[PDB]
Amino acid sequence: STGSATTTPIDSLDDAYITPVQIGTPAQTLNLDFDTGSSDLWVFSSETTASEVDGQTIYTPSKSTTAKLLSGATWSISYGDGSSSSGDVYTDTVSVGGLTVTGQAVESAKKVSSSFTEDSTIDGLLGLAFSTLNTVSPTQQKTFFDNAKASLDSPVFTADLGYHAPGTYNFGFIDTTAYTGSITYTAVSTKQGFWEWTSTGYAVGSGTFKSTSIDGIADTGTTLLYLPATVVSAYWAQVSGAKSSSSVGGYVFPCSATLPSFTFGVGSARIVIPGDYIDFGPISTGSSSCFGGIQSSAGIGINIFGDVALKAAFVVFNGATTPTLGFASK
Ligand SMILES: NCc1ccc(C(F)(F)F)cc1
Ligand SMILES: NCc1ccc(C(F)(F)F)cc1
Numbered sequence: 214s215t216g217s218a219t220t221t222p223i224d225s226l227d228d229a230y231i232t233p234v235q236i237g238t239p240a241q242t243l244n245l246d247f248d249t250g251s252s253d254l255w256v257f258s259s260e261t262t263a264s265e266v267d268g269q270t271i272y273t274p275s276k277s278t279t280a281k282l283l284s285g286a287t288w289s290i291s292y293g294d295g296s297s298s299s300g301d302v303y304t305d306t307v308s309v310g311g312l313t314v315t316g317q318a319v320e321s322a323k324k325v326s327s328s329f330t331e332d333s334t335i336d337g338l339l340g341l342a343f344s345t346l347n348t349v350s351p352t353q354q355k356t357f358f359d360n361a362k363a364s365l366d367s368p369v370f371t372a373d374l375g376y377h378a379p380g381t382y383n384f385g386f387i388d389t390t391a392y393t394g395s396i397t398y399t400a401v402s403t404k405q406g407f408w409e410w411t412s413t414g415y416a417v418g419s420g421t422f423k424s425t426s427i428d429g430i431a432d433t434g435t436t437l438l439y440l441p442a443t444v445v446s447a448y449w450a451q452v453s454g455a456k457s458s459s460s461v462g463g464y465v466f467p468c469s470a471t472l473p474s475f476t477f478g479v480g481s482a483r484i485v486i487p488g489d490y491i492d493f494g495p496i497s498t499g500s501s502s503c504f505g506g507i508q509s510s511a512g513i514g515i516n517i518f519g520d521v522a523l524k525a526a527f528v529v530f531n532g533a534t535t536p537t538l539g540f541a542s543k
Contacts, residue, residue, distance in 0.1 A: 214364050215385035216312025220247065222377065223334040226493055227520060228436050230374060231335055232382055235308040236319060237277030243270050243336035247382055248434030249372070249408050249530065252346035252356050253290050254307070255298060255320035256337035265325050268333035274321065280305045288320045288348045293513060298325040302349055307357060312384050314361050318354035338434070341370070341530070346406035358384070358532060368532045372433055373543070374524035376490055392527035392541035397482040401536040408530060410538050413480060417448050418473030422483070429516030431523060431530070431538055439510035439517040448475060448507050455505070461496055468495060468503040475507060477522060479540040486525040
């Protein structure tokens, strides 16, 4: 079987993308953030502290005839940005784009951090990293993809994120009309639970390509591109007036500048990120300083190919027994 679902940016800067997911019987539709950097399916619910809910659609397990409490199970997650949530665990039927999984662990939030409360458009997260990262205790739970794998035509899903526009997540098949050229596949390390791969180098604008190994993760759940300080410094040096700002916490640039493109290597292929994708607009309303979409990973400890990079490509997540990542131009 297969599934296909449209994913939509939550705001005009593409800060995150939401995809409708049907949970329970009869279906409750929630808009979830599909996150290849984590492995928990958690949702705002009827159990969430009322002061921590501000416009989100909630899952109500008591109204689902297929929901079962997973006795004694709990979960607690903290994200790399300092975000967190925690609560208890149901199992229920979950469908994405026509693809149905019965007995999926649905983690019900009792508590969420403030950054989730303030993001009224995101009802929860759907984790798509490897199940070794799932936080359910005492019994670890499988991801939606892991549960669906057996029944998929092909054990793959693909991410086709739009620039200021809707895109598509497909499960179980590769749409050969959605890209140009060939797909280049590259090896994945699962040893930390992430879709981790090694880029073969980079170029700034029309500069020479620099061959150099950049290890990092493919993460639909992270907005920006986080790369080593040496790389990020070479990019922003080409932008007149750009500088790293400690008060803002990253590189900013004059909003009147035009940004160079950024190229990253996948084996012998090249993915080009247009300079417009790297503009994240004014740091505050009315400011003439704009925030850059390429930032240093020095404080984070790992390099992250977030949405800025992934939306420039058609991306195959191949969950075969030897996993790989495919990139194509589009
Ligand atoms: N999108 C999930 C996520 C969040 C943070 C991290 C970090 F910072 F730990 F790498 C990885 C993955
Ligand atoms: N990388 C996972 C993640 C996704 C979204 C958020 C936000 F923006 F909703 F707070 C935080 C962390």
